[PDB]
Amino acid sequence: PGRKTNQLQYMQNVVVKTLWKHQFAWPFYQPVDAIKLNLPDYHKIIKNPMDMGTIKKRLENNYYWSASECMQDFNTMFTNCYIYNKPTDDIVLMAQALEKIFLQKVAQMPQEEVEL
Amino acid sequence: PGRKTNQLQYMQNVVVKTLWKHQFAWPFYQPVDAIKLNLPDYHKIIKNPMDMGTIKKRLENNYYWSASECMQDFNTMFTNCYIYNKPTDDIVLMAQALEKIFLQKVAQMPQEEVEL
């Protein structure tokens, strides 16, 4: 049961918008294709895949009841990357840089969630 | 095997140093590994592989006799990428940007090659 809230509008028009523009965001635009990319254990490890394109479409179609759910999807996206990849891989550093911006934006979000 | 020349020193400390720091250079730091990257037709199509890491190592180990060899290795690297990939692939647009900077620095290289 979705919902439109001040916070979900902020997730869509500030958080996703800002991250999409970042030069490190492109590995996260689409779901990880483990066969195309030769990642044969990916779905054995990552059972809850998530990507920013999915998050964007979920916001655009009022999938979420609360911005907390959208923040959880972002956390799943980042942590899936942290788990699957090795602690020193470039993609982990890219994810960490995007998560830093994500947390900076979340900190400026309206702290009270109200339906529109 | 090789020697020091003013043009090779320029290739190392101007051309390669600049290109190595460029935002688009990272796909060219290492030989294309057609096994790890799942490129089963790469060596069918590309018979003379080259990459910037190999070029940089060759300069550091005084492998080259003349800068003409180093410039041709860059040409082979870039040309291979255009032969293998689609003109719409992002890697080809990255190669284009890098090749323009390469030719810019080449134009300002010392025009007469002397041994150092």
Author numbering:
A (entry chain B), B (entry chain A): 32 to 147
Please give me the paper's original passages concerning this structure:
Bromodomains (BDs) regulate gene expression by recognizing protein motifs containing acetyllysine. BDs are small alpha-helical bundles found in ∼40 human proteins that mainly regulate gene expression. These domains harbor a deep pocket that specifically recognizes AcK-containing peptide motifs in both histones and other gene regulatory proteins such as transcription factors. To begin to address this knowledge gap in an unbiased manner, we carried out mRNA display screens against a BD—the N-terminal BD of BRD3—using peptide libraries that contained either one or two acetyllysine residues.
Because of the limited solubility of the original peptides, we synthesized analogs that incorporated two glutamates at both the N- and C-termini of each peptide to improve solubility and facilitate further characterization of the peptide–BD interactions. The glutamates thus improved solubility at the expense of affinity. Two copies of BRD3–BD1 bind a single peptide. The acetyl group of AcK6 forms the same hydrogen bond with the side chain of Asn116 that is common to all characterized BD–peptide interactions. In the second BD, the hydroxyl group of Tyr12 forms a water-mediated hydrogen bond also to Asn116 (inset). Instead, Leu7 and Leu11 form contact with the WPF shelf of the AcK6-binding BD. These residues, together with Leu8, simultaneously interact with the WPF shelf of the second BD. Finally, we note that side chains of residues N terminal to AcK6 were either not in contact with the BD or did not display any electron density, suggesting that they were likely not well ordered.
